[PDB]
Curated annotation (Swiss-Prot), chain B:
Superkingdom of the source species: Viruses
Carbohydrate attachment residues: 20, 56
Annotated function: Subunit of the fusion protein that is processed upon entry into the host cell. Mediates fusion of the virion and cellular membranes by functioning as a class I viral fusion protein. Contains a viral fusion peptide that is unmasked after S2 cleavage. This cleavage can occur at the cell membrane by host TMPRSS2 or during endocytosis by host CSTL. In either case, this triggers an extensive and irreversible conformational change that leads to fusion of the viral envelope with the cellular cytoplasmic membrane, releasing viral genomic RNA into the host cell cytoplasm.
Organism of origin: Severe acute respiratory syndrome coronavirus 2 (2019-nCoV)
Disulfide bonds listed in the record: 4-48
Protein name: Spike protein S2'
Length: 49, 66
């Protein structure tokens, strides 16, 4: 649900969209994630591993 | 995540893409305030071959009719 459950009722949202908006929060547009999603997913998985 | 008007991706400027199941709208994050998807409300980035989940739809040209 992203951060929506920290304010009121929990609102569903696909994780790629949530991550794109977390990028948009730091000043990088949505297109970066939607064009490198495989790379971000692999990097995050490797970091968690 | 994006719209593919003519073989070319389209991303929301500030909002999300939603739909009634027949028509596609661009709206805010906290309210369902639908607006017709126009080129002034979306920015082009990509070539409609890397984004996953992208739907075709159409956008509205505000200059072609006149
Ligand atoms: C990433 O997810 C995959 C599955 O979605 C995990 O794959 C299995 O993980 C278990 C748990 O260690 C292993 O016993 C299996 O051998 C894995 N199968 C394959 C085909 O890899 C994978 O472990 C996840 N990544 C991490 C770092 O846990
Ligand atoms: C969704 O919006 C469209 C706008 O063109 C409207 O015609 C339709 O009745 C609405 N609802 C559904 C279920 O499509
Ligand atoms: C969008 O239209 C093109 C042109 O016919 C087609 O090749 C493509 O498969 C369509 N995309 C989707 C998601 O239907």
């Amino acid at each position: 649900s992203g951060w929506t459950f920290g304010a009121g009722p929990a609102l569903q949202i696909p994780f790629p969209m949530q991550m794109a908006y977390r990028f948009n929060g730091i000043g990088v547009t949505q297109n970066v994630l939607y064009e490198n999603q495989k790379l971000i997913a692999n990097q995050f998985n490797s970091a968690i591993g | 995540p994006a719209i593919c008007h003519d073989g070319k991706a389209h991303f929301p400027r500030e909002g999300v893409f939603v739909s009634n199941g027949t028509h596609w709208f661009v709206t805010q994050r906290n309210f369902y305030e639908p607006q017709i998807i126009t080129t002034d409300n979306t920015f082009v980035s990509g070539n409609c071959d890397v984004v996953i989940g992208i739907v075709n739809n159409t956008v509205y040209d505000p200059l072609q009719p006149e």
